[PDB]
Design a protein around this nucleic acid. Structure first.
Lengths: 228, 219
DNA sequence: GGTATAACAGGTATA
DNA sequence: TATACCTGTTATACC
């Protein structure tokens, strides 16, 4: 450890991991694979090989580096996706106990209402083409299977991408994944009429956005979320 | 892929299914490894990940246990997230903007189902909120209590958790606080809350949203 | 004596 | 072709 300090009983792995943390915080490395390999650091610190592996693995969990296969660690910063990855541990309890299912629906409804209100209020002359091509590519009836579902979720994503906030897209993807993960026994009984109703509601929504009237858009969105 | 994450999620869902309660009820990890056809460092990495999460307790050579409280992981995630500040100077305001997208989803709900049982509660809350006198201690406590009783109107435990999380996040983020400017800030805040509760009584969510937007713009 | 923690080499998919 | 991930082995201090 370049300082002659064993620290065996007090877990010497903490010493090397905090030394690596300090060396990274000292702005002595770049943003990629500037850090050496495992054997180089092992020989430089006169320690074991599995210790450095555990250190890096713990560091990745803490959200500091990233490794894939046959490449050194790439130092980065913990973004919004890292927080969502570290979370979701208690999400199973919510779907386990009877409640919470309506709470997630209410949260999603509030989020979508807020974002559609912001989009209708800050409606520029360029984002109209995005929603136009979205409703155009989601207008034809060619595949009544899962293609319409992915088209609808892509339309929702491009609608949520209007503000331009990295945390917004992250939480949107997280909520959509947590919602589609709790859809058991999906059957194709009345999904075609559901697709037609969704198309009509999207047409009404874009018409209300063009006319600058969030009331009708909010009513159509509430009706769509109540019809499920 | 990586075996580690597989057995990690397996033991996570096992401890979530309430298969083992308090104490050292887990079997020997050697025969677990022999049955799962995994490696020794994988189990050590899984235990280290669980210790970093804050669910098990390993000191010397004893076995792991369960952890019912969840306050350690909260401050852990707080310290881990409150770091991305020097990268984006104004992007933090985006996070503040997120708070907007939350509060605008609250003042427009009082006119939905609140009839009289919540009106008395918010009135008796704002009574003490206005009776408060201290600028740094009483006014901040009154403001957070008003925000809590506002978030508790729909009756949702997730909303309260999100609100307190945003509160502690902004508290850890903002490093400098004022006293003279905060006085007029909370003054205008409760002056606008008066109009907010007036519009709530009159069943007009537009005026409440406008007052909230003006309060957020006043900073 | 059981416990975790320590060290080493060897075979193989992959960029 | 060079890389790291996974699997093989044994030695040692403490309760």
């Amino acid at each position: 450890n370049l300082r002659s300090r064993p620290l065996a009983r007090k877990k010497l792995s903490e010493m090397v991991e905090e030394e690596l943390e300090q060396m990274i915080r000292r702005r002595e490395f770049g943003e990629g694979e500037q850090l050496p390999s495992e054997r180089e650091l092992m020989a430089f610190f006169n320690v074991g090989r599995p210790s450095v592996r555990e250190a890096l693995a713990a560091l990745k969990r803490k959200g500091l580096v990233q490794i894939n296969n046959g490449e050194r660690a790439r130092v980065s910063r913990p973004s919004a996706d890292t927080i969502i990855g570290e979370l979701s541990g208690m999400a199973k309890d919510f779907l386990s106990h009877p409640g919470g299912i309506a709470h997630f629906e209410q949260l999603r409804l509030f989020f979508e209402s807020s974002l559609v209100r912001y989009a209708a209020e800050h409606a520029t002359d360029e984002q109209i083409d995005l929603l136009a091509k979205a409703l155009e590519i989601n207008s034809q009836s060619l595949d009544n299977n899962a293609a319409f579902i992915r088209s609808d979720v892509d339309f929702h994503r491009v609608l949520a991408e209007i503000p331009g906030n990295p945390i917004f897209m992250a939480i949107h993807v997280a909520l959509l994944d947590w919602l589609i993960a709790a859809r058991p026994t999906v059957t194709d009984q009345a999904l075609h009429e559901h697709n037609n109703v969704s198309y009509q509601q999207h047409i009404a929504i874009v018409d209300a956005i063009r006319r600058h009237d969030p009331d009708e858009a909010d009513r159509a969105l509430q009706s769509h979320l109540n019809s499920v």
